[PDB]
Amino acid sequence: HMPPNRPGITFEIGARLEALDYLQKWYPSRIEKIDYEEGKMLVHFERWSHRYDEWIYWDSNRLRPLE
């Protein structure tokens, strides 16, 4: 129910992070929505169509802080 502690990532709508994309490249993204019951969030890749927004569990190693 509470997001994990991942320094450099703020678990709030609109916060930014990097997500490992379909080309295995780290890509700048932002949090659209959070699912606190299932422990996941909806991630939007910067400039992409929202068709590609992806639900990713909040402890995923496919997320990292945006340096």
In whole angstroms, give the CA distance from residue 58 to residue 40.
5
Q: What is the 3-state secondary structure (H, E, C) of 11-65?
A: CCCCCEEEEECCCCCEEEEEEEEEECCCCEEEEEECCCCHHHCEEEECCCCCEEC
Considering Cα of 29, then 30, then 32, then 33, what sign does the dihedral take? Answer: positive
In whole angstroms, give the CA distance from residue 29 to residue 17.
5
The token duo for 29 is 């993204």
Q: Are strands 16-20 and 63-64 parallel, antiparallel or unpaired?
A: antiparallel
- Technique used to solve these coordinates: X-ray
The domain limits of the chain are 1-67
Position 25, amino acid? K
Contact between 35 and 41 (Cβ < 8 Å)? yes
In whole angstroms, give the CA distance from residue 9 to residue 40.
14
